Design a protein around this ligand. Sequence first.
Ligand SMILES: *Cc1c(COP(=O)(O)O)cnc(C)c1O
Length: 228
Amino acid sequence: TGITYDEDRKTQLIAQYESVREVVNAEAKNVKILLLVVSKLKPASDIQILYDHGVREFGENYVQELIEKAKLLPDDIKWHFIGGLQTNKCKDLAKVPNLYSVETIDSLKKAKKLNESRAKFQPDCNPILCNVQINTSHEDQKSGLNNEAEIFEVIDFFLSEECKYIKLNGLMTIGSWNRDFATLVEWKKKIDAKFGTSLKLSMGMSADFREAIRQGTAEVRIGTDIFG
Ligand SMILES: *Cc1c(COP(=O)(O)O)cnc(C)c1O
């Protein structure tokens, strides 16, 4: 049956979502890109609209909010967890079967906890794709790595034979408030050179996604421009 929704809202949200997709695509041609639809704090009905339209990759920031939404909505959604990740919440997150991606690995202890919890609670699911989150701000932020030695230790773990239930996909930055995107591109260059990787970048939100695309992102993460 699905979550019931208003048709004027349906028409409006579909229109906004298509308008963004068209711009992502036109920027990408002048230079696919993943358009991650960020639905954090938006109602399950709004997700249902876009799901019915054909969208599958949705980004959420709060652990309990994601777990409940995942139960309410179809199981072939690919959820991305893109908010603050606490070591003591990896077990709850690793229980969601269709947890497709976590983009906020910012410590070795978190990577290790997530791998272990996933081995424990959903061994038979596809490994969670992970981005390592970097503080590109050159200031001091609550989240994101900045020390080269500690970033390399995290990548090293992900490439080890022990890291079986999560898989290194890329790097992620929320940036700052484009030199942030240039510094994540430089981190990709160093990491790729040292370890043999070819990391995907996740950078670009509603205010700055056009620049992100222009500087080589593989994924932009858009909330406000779509759900408006
Ligand atoms: C909220 C959020 C987004 C979307 O931000 P908008 O300005 O609404 O497009 C993208 N990435 C992360 C990590 C976020 O928390």
